[PDB]
Amino acid sequence: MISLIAALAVDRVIGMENAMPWNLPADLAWFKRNTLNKPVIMGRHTWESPAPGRKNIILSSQPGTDDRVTWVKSVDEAIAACGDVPEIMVIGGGRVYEQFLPKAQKLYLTHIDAEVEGDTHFPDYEPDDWESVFSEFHDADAQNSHSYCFEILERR
Numbered sequence: 001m002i003s004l005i006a007a008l009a010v011d012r013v014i015g016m017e018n019a020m021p022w023n024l025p026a027d028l029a030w031f032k033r034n035t036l037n038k039p040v041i042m043g044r045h046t047w048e049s050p051a052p053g054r055k056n057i058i059l060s061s062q063p064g065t066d067d068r069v070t071w072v073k074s075v076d077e078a079i080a081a082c083g084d085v086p087e088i089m090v091i092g093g094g095r096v097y098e099q100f101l102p103k104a105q106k107l108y109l110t111h112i113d114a115e116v117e118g119d120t121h122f123p124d125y126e127p128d129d130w131e132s133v134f135s136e137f138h139d140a141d142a143q144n145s146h147s148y149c150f151e152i153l154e155r156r
């Protein structure tokens with residue numbers, strides 16, 4: 001199966017020109033928990049923003065610039081490069097999420113209570129086509145700049 005994992009500010013914002021204006025170590029821990037040793041697919045810009053022991057698949061139209069990871073030129077090649085595995089984790093960014101959302105069966109979302117002026121958004125998903133199977137709210141605290149909610153949705 002294919003899953004997407006993403007951190008969304010209000011209005012589904014996921015990315016900006018520069019680093020995001022927040023500090024959310026709990027979201028990093030959650031991202032690690034749900035990726036671990038599974039294959040990851042990402043776009044070239046996310047890659048520029050590796051883990052041995054797992055397949056790291058980078059989408060780019062151009063030849064790769066780092067032999068430590070696996071470079072592919074199409075969505076079909078990316079899926080093929082992950083092999084037969086229980087779960088493929090698509091970790092960004094916006095262009096890559098848009099292409100894999102119709103193929104995905106699971107979304108792992110972090111809803112962040114922050115308003116940020118961004119240039120990249122998570123794709124529109126119809127909540128009626130998705131079943132929320134897990135949700136967990138957390139307050140901002142000494143380590144996390146904003147409140148945040150972890151949610152897992154499975155496709156209906």
Ligand SMILES: NC(=O)c1ccc[n+]([C@@H]2O[C@H](COP(=O)([O-])OP(=O)(O)OC[C@H]3O[C@@H](n4cnc5c(N)ncnc54)[C@H](OP(=O)(O)O)[C@@H]3O)[C@@H](O)[C@H]2O)c1
Nearest residue numbers: 043044045046059060061073074075092093094095096119
């Ligand atoms: N392309 C542009 O016009 C351009 C220029 C400057 C800045 N930016 C900015 O970069 C920021 C990050 O965007 P993002 O989060 O969407 O990036 P992302 O998904 O992390 O990476 C997108 C990159 O992944 C590669 N890619 C995605 N789908 C592909 C496919 N089907 N086949 C082959 N390669 C594929 C392309 O790399 P390659 O580019 O290496 O082919 C593409 O540029 C955005 O803010 C955007 O405005 C875009």
Ligand SMILES: [Ca+2]
Nearest residue numbers: 015016017018
């Ligand atoms: Ca960015």
